């Protein structure tokens, strides 16, 4: 089966470990044997100053590559959201997809490994957004994961063995004069900060 | 203490990853160090023809395990029903989905209770037996695939199988759970190949696919 | 950052595996990067002689704190109830609104101990719980104590330990770890002189799933 799903991640902290907003909100087209995503899109959010952005970008990636199935972040057990929970805002949006294209759009929510995996992805794109920005970022990671830092690319993968090895990688410039570390939030448990500082 | 726990798992998938029923029922004995079972039971289901409403996976689990309770002799009973670990013969109305399912288990639970004196407690995830006889059921599933084969089995949340020639092991993914795992002793079949992967509807479950 | 955290965890069990009382209350300082404590204070109970109701624990757990944050100076202590990260100076029966019906018995032991400790250095008390990580570490610590007490204390014992963690035995210490991988990490290191005569077995408690058992029996 061949899903696209989209999730919003990562989020600028202040000198207080308290959240400023938003990063990165990510589409991802996951497959077979769906651990990671080759297939992905990203909208940058503006930190320092939403389901609707996810099912955008989704729908956007979707024409794209067609798939089977959209995921969205909603949990309400895999309904058709077209068959319809604030996100009956989205049924009518749902219907006329459906009738364009034929493809459902499913509310899913945690339930969805390709929404976790977008969830990961937009945490490695909100470290290459602190790569591209960085004199001191706070980057909070969305929910147990950790990031690996290479020359040319970065790879995100899950805390939790229990969901299967899930893992993520993109492509990118890595600046020198730059020092990061990664490290957990002391306020929020099983939550990793990502502290990058400029050399 | 030494403990009968049941359970029901695996779920033959359609092709939207979406189960059409359910395939084995495993009651086990646990002692100590409880991570394993050396003793237990398993009845198959029919997959193709079942009830997914939770009725027959229920009463198949609490009759398999009163029957291996018969044998052992144990402390108790766990059952898969997640209510506080009030026994069965209490289960009322009052004292609470389940109340449906209370109707044909208080009375099987009290006629239980006063031939043996063994209670039968709705623990449910909180027992590790239940955990335990749930990863045998992954593994029962996994042996059953092996015979009936392509398919496409859910396991039981976040565990997987390893195939050797002779035998079939399981074990939980997750390491706060501290190393839960089961054997069962199988024949493995030729002209055939097997995968696991991440269930993509179902977060933290595990898909076997066998062709 | 710098904090301090308190909780109250370790228990003797019965052999039908359940809590008779806790044991170890202990408070911690924990710094970036926040997966470990160098500098911490402990208090035991008497697990038969224990309240349930939480009262004397969080008493405890509270004045540890605070005793250990006088001389560490941290920035914030973390208290082991989870109200959202409310400041205990300001914990009033007003403000509180069975958990609201219990916390403002708590309050009025809690509060003004917090209001005098604020005004003396600045520092707030927050009602954090269970989403901070050094209460967890602090927890982490309690079960590590619990253990030390157990060893010091036994012709058989059972102890309870925190959720999901381990305890290694070591010939001058004790280290405690969490067993989940999603926290990153944290752990604690209690020196302490292993007694002889015991031996001692980790193992799930069946009636609790991702809670272990540690058990300790006398030799001969
Ligand atoms: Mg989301
Ligand atoms: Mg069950
Ligand atoms: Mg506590």
Redesign the interface.
């Known amino acids: 089966?061949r899903?696209v799903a989209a999730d919003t991640g990562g989020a600028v902290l202040d000198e207080?470990?308290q959240p400023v907003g938003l990063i990165a909100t990510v589409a991802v087209l996951?497959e077979?044997?769906?651990?990671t995503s080759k297939r992905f899109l990203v909208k940058y959010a503006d930190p320092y100053n939403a389901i609707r952005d996810e099912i955008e970008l989704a729908i956007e990636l979707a024409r794209e590559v067609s798939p089977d199935?959209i995921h969205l972040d909603s949990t309400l057990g895999?309904i058709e959201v077209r068959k319809l929970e604030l996100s009956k805002d989205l049924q009518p949006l749902a219907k006329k997809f459906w009738e364009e294209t034929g493809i459902e759009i499913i509310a899913?929510g945690?339930?969805?490994?390709?929404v976790?995996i977008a969830e990961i992805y937009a945490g490695i794109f909100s470290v290459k957004w602190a790569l591209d920005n960085v004199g001191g970022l706070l980057v909070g990671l969305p929910?147990?994961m950790?990031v690996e830092i290479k020359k040319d690319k970065i790879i995100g993968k899950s805390?939790?063995?229990?969901?299967?090895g899930?893992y993520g990688e993109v492509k990118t410039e890595v600046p020198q004069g730059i020092k990061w570390?990664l490290?957990?939030?002391?306020?929020?448990?099983?939550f990793?900060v990502f502290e990058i500082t400029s050399k």
């Open positions: 089966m899903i207080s470990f996951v077979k044997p769906y651990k199935v895999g899913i945690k339930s969805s490994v390709p976790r929910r147990y950790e805390l939790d063995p229990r969901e299967g899930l570390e490290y957990p939030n002391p306020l929020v448990r099983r990793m």
